[PDB]
Amino acid sequence: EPVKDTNGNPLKIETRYFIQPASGGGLVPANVDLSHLCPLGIVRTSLPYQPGLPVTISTNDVLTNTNIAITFDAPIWLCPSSKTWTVDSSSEEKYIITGGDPKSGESFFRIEKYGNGKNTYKLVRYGKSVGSTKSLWGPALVLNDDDDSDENAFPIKFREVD
Amino acid sequence: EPVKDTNGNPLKIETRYFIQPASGGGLVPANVDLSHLCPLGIVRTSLPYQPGLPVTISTPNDVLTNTNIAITFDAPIWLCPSSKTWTVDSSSEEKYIITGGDPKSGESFFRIEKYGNGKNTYKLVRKSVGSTKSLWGPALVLNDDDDSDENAFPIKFREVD
Amino acid sequence: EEPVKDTNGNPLKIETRYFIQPASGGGLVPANVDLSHLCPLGIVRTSLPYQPGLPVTISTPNDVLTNTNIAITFDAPIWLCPSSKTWTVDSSSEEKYIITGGDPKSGESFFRIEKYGNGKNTYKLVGKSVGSTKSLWGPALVLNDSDENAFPIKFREVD
Amino acid sequence: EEPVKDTNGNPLKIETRYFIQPASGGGLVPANVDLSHLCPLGIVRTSLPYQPGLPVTISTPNDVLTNTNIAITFDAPIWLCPSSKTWTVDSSSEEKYIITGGDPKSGESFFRIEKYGNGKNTYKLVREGKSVGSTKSLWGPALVLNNAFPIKFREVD
Ligand code: CHL
Ligand code: CHL
Ligand code: CHL
Ligand code: CHL
């Protein structure tokens, strides 16, 4: 099944989208704690009209339950690593962090339908769903223990940036 | 004559708008230099899809051109001890527009006037509001005159839904 | 009403720079207490072992004596906040953080230096003693007299 | 190859903490050079007069001698960047900032301590040899590869 944006249109690669909580504003880079500034975690901004930092998806169609990479799109980057999402294996909390390799399997996630709402999804990694936990700046994306139910998943939509 | 938003609808008081450059993204609070963190200047973010921090307009519900208004940022968090209302830093050589003004005092009053080319395009006048290079990017400053649109920073108002 | 002494056993002088160093990381420095405000500033113990702290000068409403009204003012060539460098109590707060921006001549900014424990050149600030709580950067000074919950300090003369 | 001396005129030891302080603000510390990056870090003179600097240890690739390959490594219980505390040259900057994140065993991280001018116990760093100087950066003077930036070593404690 093709992933759809908030307008019900199918997701394309090489196309800028805000990832916005379906459940404050969009998802942005921020540090998870005071122990490291780089690499960056993924936090929901508490500011209501901030749309989030845009991402592009790499594989023109994006389909559900398929290996994809998510890369922030930004003209400025304060860290010496990449803008591609990945899992902090060395973190005892398994934060989703930047600095992944867009071609490597370390950076692969899958987009799956969430609950009933249309155009609502979750991310799953290999199967563990992406949830959230309290961090310094607010809720940060973390890898949950499993993907048995949507209970612990952080529901998202994709909004096309024009 | 009523000020209009990007949809051509007239501006209302107590209504959130993005002030967006007509000439990066919207206008946001940021420090102008390394000498002070508070109060805050008004900077154009270089990030292309950042809409700006919303403002509300007050009158000392219609907003009309060439009339005294106050501009106040709207935000659930504020890192400085002073107000979210725009004003002129009289004590700076640059005459930065800064936060921390009194919305009821005349120090915080600006006027919205039509700007050159393009529908629903405006400038602020107190002397027109222009911009200069600052630490984080272009910061709003009060110019010398309002003789022409040359030095004015053109803006539009986009309704926040 | 005996003189407060520095780590060299010399009596404290007014208008003289001292590091206030925890008597039990490095010295006391200005830092934000939480993510809700940058200004005004709280008083935090740096976790860095050889950072001496930001110097303060003491004023009196030349000896600094115990159990006497004094004001503490940070000494620095730059200040990123619009208010003063004088310590005071955040009168309306939960933890009653000690914060900058006080008036050194006003009673709002008065503290008293008293002996702490049965030790040597060790003190506390005070009815209510100055303690600490966990904050963003580390321990921050808060207003709590007994030396149970007091934050013990010493004074090191700066040269 | 004569021994480098600290501010007390005592010879420098390897694996010993020193402040590197400008020979005539306070000591040298890690800080960002500009708004383009937080990591890795530059080497800046703090403008605060009583800040001694962040301590370093010197390693040899127990006396530290002049005109010999040495590595400089900051010593700290915390580090906010994902790389090492060892000094090196930012080859891919036009300023050639001295930056952290070097390999203490690689030749990229080797400097030499040479006597500077007249003052006793005063030195410069050299990496044909190029001396370490300074340029204006965001917070203040930052060390760059080229006068030289004269330094002294103060024993911690
Ligand atoms: C590597 C350092 C880094 C840090 C520390 C942060 C931190 C933050 N980012 Mg991120 N980012 C960082 C890198 C990057 N970000 C982004 C892109 C974005 C976007 C698009 C957004 C964020 C936002 C946020 C904020 C999310 C929480 C919040 O809503 O607070 C509530 C908000 C505030 C308290 C206002 C903060 C104002 C100012 C932007 C930062 C404050 C300046 C002071 C230095 C604060 C430092 C305080 C210290 C003591 C902790 C948070 C301040 C969101 C945000 O709210 O920004 C306005 C947001 O929309 N970031 C990019 C791509 C350009 C980065 C590149 O390296
Ligand atoms: C009080 C201090 C204060 C400071 C220093 C800033 C600083 C900034 N604000 Mg502002 N703000 C501050 C107060 C507040 N802001 C806001 C609301 C906003 C909004 C909505 C936005 C800003 C944005 C900005 C940035 C505009 C420049 C840019 O385009 O960068 C390009 C972006 C970067 C260089 C990445 C910066 C990411 C991150 C937020 C952390 C930056 C802080 C650093 C870790 C510390 C210093 C690092 C240096 C070396 C870069 C700039 C970093 C804009 C922005 O871009 O934010 C993401 C923006 O959209 N501010 C509020 C209301 C809550 C404030 C209330 O106090
Ligand atoms: C709002 C302004 C302001 C803020 C946020 C701080 C914050 C801090 N001061 Mg303070 N200060 C501030 C104003 C002032 N300080 C000082 C003088 C001092 C001195 C002398 C010292 C401090 C120190 C500290 C630090 C204590 C915690 C620690 O031990 O970390 C330990 C060290 C680290 C965690 C490494 C990172 C340090 C780096 C300078 C912070 C970088 C900020 C991040 C890039 C932003 C990311 C923040 C995230 C949360 C958003 C803390 C970072 C102490 C310190 O440790 O300095 C290094 C210290 O010795 N301050 C003066 C007079 C000049 C100020 C005047 O305005
Ligand atoms: C991103 C990482 C990082 C950044 C941005 C800095 C930045 C700085 N360090 Mg460094 N450091 C950083 C990493 C680390 N430092 C250190 C250890 C030290 C030491 C021991 C010292 C520094 C000091 C400094 C300052 C030197 C310039 C000065 O004299 O300011 C003058 C001081 C001020 C202007 C007031 C202090 C500012 C306050 C700490 C926070 C400033 C951040 C702003 C509130 C946020 C907004 C930023 C601006 C751009 C809008 C400078 C602010 C020196 C210093 O002065 O600290 C107080 C210093 O003594 N650093 C360690 C080991 C723990 C790090 C590990 O990662």
Coordinates of C-alpha atoms and ligand atoms in Angstrom, one line a residue, chain A residues 35 37-38 78, chain B residues 31 33-34 36-37 135-136, chain C residues 29-32 38 41 46-48 50-52 54 77-80 137, chain D residues 25-35 37-42 44-48 50-55 74-81 85 138-140, ligand 4:
Chain A
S35 CA 26.1 14.7 27.8
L37 CA 25.4 18.0 21.6
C38 CA 26.3 15.8 18.6
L78 CA 25.9 22.1 13.4
Chain B
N31 CA 19.9 38.0 20.1
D33 CA 25.0 40.3 19.3
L34 CA 27.2 38.5 21.9
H36 CA 23.4 40.5 25.7
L37 CA 20.9 37.6 25.5
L135 CA 24.9 37.7 14.5
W136 CA 22.2 35.2 13.4
Chain C
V29 CA 29.4 30.1 38.8
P30 CA 26.3 31.8 37.1
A31 CA 24.2 29.4 35.0
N32 CA 20.5 29.0 34.1
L38 CA 18.1 32.4 30.5
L41 CA 20.9 33.6 36.4
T46 CA 30.5 23.7 38.0
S47 CA 31.3 20.0 37.6
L48 CA 34.7 20.8 36.1
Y50 CA 39.8 22.9 38.1
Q51 CA 37.4 25.7 37.4
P52 CA 37.7 28.0 40.4
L54 CA 33.4 33.1 39.1
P77 CA 34.0 42.1 32.5
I78 CA 30.9 40.9 30.6
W79 CA 27.3 40.0 31.6
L80 CA 24.8 38.5 29.2
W137 CA 23.6 22.0 35.0
Chain D
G25 CA 41.6 37.2 29.6
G26 CA 42.6 33.8 31.0
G27 CA 43.7 30.4 29.6
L28 CA 43.1 28.4 26.5
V29 CA 39.7 26.6 26.4
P30 CA 37.6 24.6 23.9
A31 CA 35.0 26.8 22.2
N32 CA 33.2 27.0 18.8
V33 CA 35.0 29.2 16.2
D34 CA 31.8 30.3 14.4
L35 CA 28.1 29.6 14.1
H37 CA 29.6 24.1 13.7
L38 CA 29.5 23.1 17.4
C39 CA 31.8 20.1 16.8
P40 CA 34.7 19.7 16.6
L41 CA 35.9 22.5 18.8
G42 CA 38.5 25.3 18.4
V44 CA 40.1 30.0 22.2
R45 CA 41.5 32.4 24.8
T46 CA 38.7 33.0 27.3
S47 CA 38.1 36.6 28.0
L48 CA 37.3 36.0 31.7
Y50 CA 40.6 34.4 36.3
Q51 CA 39.6 31.4 34.3
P52 CA 42.9 29.3 34.1
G53 CA 42.0 27.5 30.9
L54 CA 41.0 23.8 30.4
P55 CA 44.0 21.6 31.5
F74 CA 42.6 18.3 26.9
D75 CA 41.7 16.7 30.2
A76 CA 38.1 16.9 31.2
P77 CA 35.4 14.6 32.9
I78 CA 32.9 15.5 30.2
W79 CA 33.0 16.1 26.4
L80 CA 30.1 17.3 24.4
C81 CA 31.5 16.3 21.0
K85 CA 40.3 15.8 23.1
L138 CA 33.3 34.4 17.5
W139 CA 34.3 34.4 21.2
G140 CA 37.8 35.9 20.9
Ligands
CHL4 C1 29.7 23.3 21.7 C2 30.5 23.1 22.7 C3 31.1 24.3 23.3 C4 30.9 25.7 23.1 C5 29.9 26.3 22.1 C6 31.8 26.2 24.0 C7 32.0 27.6 24.3 C8 32.8 28.2 25.1 N1 33.6 27.7 26.0 MG1 33.9 25.7 26.2 N2 32.5 25.3 24.7 C9 32.1 24.2 24.3 C10 32.6 22.9 24.8 C11 33.4 22.6 26.0 N3 34.0 23.6 26.6 C12 34.7 23.0 27.6 C13 35.5 23.6 28.6 C14 35.5 25.0 28.8 C15 36.2 25.7 29.9 C16 36.9 25.3 31.1 C17 35.9 27.1 29.5 C18 35.2 27.1 28.4 C19 34.9 28.4 27.9 C20 34.1 28.6 26.7 C21 33.8 30.0 26.3 C22 35.0 30.7 25.8 C23 34.7 32.2 25.3 C24 34.5 33.1 26.4 O1 35.4 33.6 27.0 O2 33.2 33.5 26.8 C25 33.0 34.4 27.9 C26 32.0 33.9 28.8 C27 30.7 34.2 28.6 C28 30.3 35.0 27.5 C29 29.6 33.7 29.5 C30 29.6 32.2 29.5 C31 28.5 31.7 28.5 C32 27.8 30.5 29.1 C33 28.8 29.4 29.5 C34 26.9 29.9 28.0 C35 27.0 30.6 26.7 C36 26.0 29.9 25.8 C37 24.9 30.8 25.5 C38 24.1 31.1 26.8 C39 23.9 30.3 24.5 C40 23.8 31.2 23.3 C41 25.1 31.2 22.5 C42 25.3 32.5 21.8 C43 26.1 32.2 20.5 C44 23.9 33.0 21.4 C45 32.9 29.7 25.2 C46 31.5 30.3 25.6 C47 35.4 29.4 28.9 C48 34.4 30.2 29.6 O3 34.5 31.3 29.7 O4 33.3 29.6 30.3 C49 32.5 30.4 31.2 C50 36.1 28.5 29.9 O5 36.7 29.0 30.9 N4 35.0 25.8 27.9 C51 34.6 21.5 27.6 C52 35.1 20.6 28.6 C53 34.0 20.3 29.5 C54 33.7 21.3 26.5 C55 33.3 20.0 26.1 O6 32.6 19.7 25.2

